[PDB]
Design a protein around this ligand. Structure first.
Ligand SMILES: *[C@@H]1O[C@H](CO)[C@@H](O[C@@H]2O[C@H](CO)[C@@H](O)[C@H](O)[C@H]2NC(C)=O)[C@H](O)[C@H]1NC(C)=O
Ligand SMILES: *[C@@H]1O[C@H](CO)[C@@H](O[C@@H]2O[C@H](CO)[C@@H](O)[C@H](O)[C@H]2NC(C)=O)[C@H](O)[C@H]1NC(C)=O
Ligand SMILES: [Cu+2]
Ligand SMILES: [Cu+2]
Ligand SMILES: [Cu+2]
Ligand SMILES: [Cu+2]
Length: 497
């Protein structure tokens, strides 16, 4: 069952074996992925997170981010450790109490402390629309139509050796899949459909790193939502989905009753489908309980290309229709060297005092804010443009902005900008060498908002900055509860800081 919008959520350690290999994990709700948190647009969510972690190998502190929810007036509830809060310590709990006005779509939640989400703290977060403009396009939309794609590691996140390459050991679809090496015939996930019905499949990348080439043998997929933003219908037969992105697509159960492979090919780790790696099963009601015998094409006919997506609503693009046509036009220098990433020459290292607390305590320019050179002020009520030229090692990098979605004025692998009708989203691949992926948004949400690569290993290695949006109005806009004010003293006492 789905939980929420008012719920407890316990964070525990447990052993799991999603690919047949047992290892300890950090879990929400006792499962991997965690349970779906759900409600309706505009609802009040009160997620009381109980930190019951005891195993220091995966960190006993935690903090949870609600990915893609704007948190307007509740920046303190956003979750990134040392940006909006100190972590919750073990044996304590914290109520993330926020509202979701004006948003409806497919989201997710994850630890936002270190690389802890890789150790298991990740799950779906759905905000339904009782008046969804897409409602007539499908018959079924429920917990059985959520599809999560996850990378899974045998080595614990904190134990990944300095200086060796990090790759996953299994792809998990709805929490199950097979290991790339020492493959065993562990159970695969089954997604069940009824011949003749149409399903809103909510595809969620909960990846710490790889992008996936997602497809379903014999079927095509009609995209209707991108990162929470309703889209015009776009029919594709493969979706390249980067870490933290979401799509809804209509699946029409219009093929013969049978079994079809669901494929999720990561860009690193095991290549292909031998032994049933990178796979799940689409099973029609009445089909034999057996593996599919289908194959993929050699070449997909209609892969998703991001410039083909357009909003359902008339969202336009803020600003003027040329490069630099914004109130605050920025170009970030994104680089990697010697194990660390940098933005404008500064590698992100989390500060001792969370950025929000520094602002509430009276630090009112971004030059005053720690870490020095990692916090950039944005002016209020202004059009912002951010160019994110690629080239840094470890790409393609999926950049994500908290507190906002944005127009993707320029996408990967295409030099032509779109100032008319590009998709809006919250996580975007910045592409390959020579690209100039560019985003735009307006600043109507005071507070410190993280901007970073969503490959968690890259965030850990410094690939981030904080946009301190409307510093002067942050305190008035974001009243804080006593429990939030209590977090840093409790954390600092427990850690002798
Ligand atoms: C990406 O686009 C930005 C503008 O959005 C380019 O920025 C300009 O960079 C040149 C130097 O390279 C400056 O002289 C301009 O002041 C910048 N802003 C402009 C023209 O609006 C940037 O060069 C582009 N990067 C790549 C790799 O194509
Ligand atoms: C590269 O991106 C551009 C800009 O998004 C795409 O150009 C648009 O193409 C559509 C479809 O033919 C036209 O309706 C628009 O008028 C074009 N806009 C602009 C600004 O040119 C283009 O299709 C993309 N290239 C590829 C190969 O997909
Ligand atoms: Cu996220
Ligand atoms: Cu986020
Ligand atoms: Cu990256
Ligand atoms: Cu983040």
């Amino acid at each position: 069952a789905q939980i929420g919008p008012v719920t407890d959520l316990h964070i525990t350690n447990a052993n799991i074996s999603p690919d047949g290999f047992s290892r300890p994990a950090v879990l929400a709700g006792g499962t991997f992925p965690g349970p779906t948190i759900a409600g309706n647009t505009g609802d009040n969510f009160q997620i009381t997170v109980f930190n019951d972690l005891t195993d220091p190998s995966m960190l006993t502190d935690t903090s949870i981010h609600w990915h893609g929810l704007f948190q307007k007036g509740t920046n303190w509830a956003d979750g990134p450790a040392f940006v909006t809060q100190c972590p919750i310590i073990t044996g304590q709990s914290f109520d993330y109490n926020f509202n979701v006005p004006g948003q409806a779509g497919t989201f997710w939640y994850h630890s936002h402390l270190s690389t802890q989400y890789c150790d298991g703290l990740r799950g779906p977060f759905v905000v339904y629309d009782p008046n969804d403009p897409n409602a007539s396009l499908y018959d079924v939309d429920d917990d059985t139509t959520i599809i999560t794609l996850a990378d899974w590691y045998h080595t614990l996140a904190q134990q990944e050796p300095i200086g060796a390459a990090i790759t996953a050991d299994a792809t998990l679809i709805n929490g199950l899949g097979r290991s790339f090496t020492n493959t065993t015939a562990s159970p695969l996930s089954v997604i069940t459909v009824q011949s003749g019905k149409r399903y809103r499949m909510r595809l969620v990348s909960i990846s710490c790193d790889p992008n996936y080439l997602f497809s379903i043998d014999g079927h095509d997929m009609t995209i209707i939502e991108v990162d929470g933003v309703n889209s015009q219908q776009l029919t594709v037969d493969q979706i390249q989905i980067f870490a933290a992105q979401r799509y809804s697509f209509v699946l029409n159960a219009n093929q013969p009753v049978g079994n079809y492979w669901i494929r999720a090919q990561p860009n690193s780790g095991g290549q292909g489908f031998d032994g049933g790696i990178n796979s799940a099963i689409l099973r029609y009601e009445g089909a034999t309980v057996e593996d599919p015998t289908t194959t993929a094409p050699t070449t997909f006919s209609n892969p998703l290309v991001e410039t083909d997506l357009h909003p359902l609503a008339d969202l336009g693009v803020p600003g003027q229709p040329f490069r630099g046509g914004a109130d605050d036009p920025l170009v970030l220098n994104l680089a990697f060297a010697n194990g660390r990433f940098s933005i404008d020459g500064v590698s992100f290292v989390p500060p001792t005092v969370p950025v929000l607390l520094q602002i509430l305590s009276g630090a009112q320019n971004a030059q005053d804010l720690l870490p020095a050179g990692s916090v950039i002020s944005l002016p209020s009520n202004s059009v912002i443009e951010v160019a994110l030229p690629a080239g840094a090692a470890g790409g393609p990098h999926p950049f994500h902005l908290h507190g906002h979605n944005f127009a993707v004025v320029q996408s990967a692998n295409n030099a032509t900008p779109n100032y008319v009708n590009p998709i809006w989203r919250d996580t975007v691949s910045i592409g390959g060498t020579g690209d100039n992926v560019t985003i735009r948004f307006t600043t109507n949400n005071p507070g410190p908002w993280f901007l970073h690569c969503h490959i968690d290993w890259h965030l850990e290695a410094g690939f981030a900055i904080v946009f301190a949006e409307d510093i002067p109005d942050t305190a008035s806009a974001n009243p804080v509860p006593q429990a939030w004010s209590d977090l840093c003293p409790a954390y600092d006492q427990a850690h002798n800081i």
